[PDB]
Every structure is written in C-alpha cells, then in structure tokens.
Amino acid sequence: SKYGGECSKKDNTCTYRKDGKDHIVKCPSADNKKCEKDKNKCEYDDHHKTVDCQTPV
Ligand SMILES: [Cl-]
Ligand SMILES: [Cl-]
Numbered sequence: 001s002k003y004g005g006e007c008s009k010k011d012n013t014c015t016y017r018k019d020g021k022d023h024i025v026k027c028p029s030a031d032n033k034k035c036e037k038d039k040n041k042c043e044y045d046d047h048h049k050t051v052d053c054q055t056p057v
Pocket of ligand 1: 025026
C-alpha cells in the first residue's frame, strides 16, 4: 500500500521504492506535506493515491 522514500528540498520531490525501482514524484505544495527538510522520509500511498513529504516520524 505505502511505499517509502526520501525527499529533495530543492526539487520538492519524493523518490520512493516500488517493485524494485525508484520513482520520482512531486511532493505536494501544501505547507505540511512539502519537502521541508532535505532527505526527510516521504511516502507514496497507492491506496489513497497520495504523496506526503512530511511522513510522521
Ligand atoms: Cl504530479
Ligand atoms: Cl498528493
């Protein structure tokens, strides 16, 4: 369901691992979902069809 990765602050992207490959998606522009911290945990949720670059730690 959920595929983890790390985010790029400069690009506001999430690079997530899914089925043995890396996939680069834009994070949201939303204040509390954008990549705030370089290399922060992000997730692509394939159930909800969402990206979050502020994954709860
Ligand atoms: Cl997009
Ligand atoms: Cl999204």
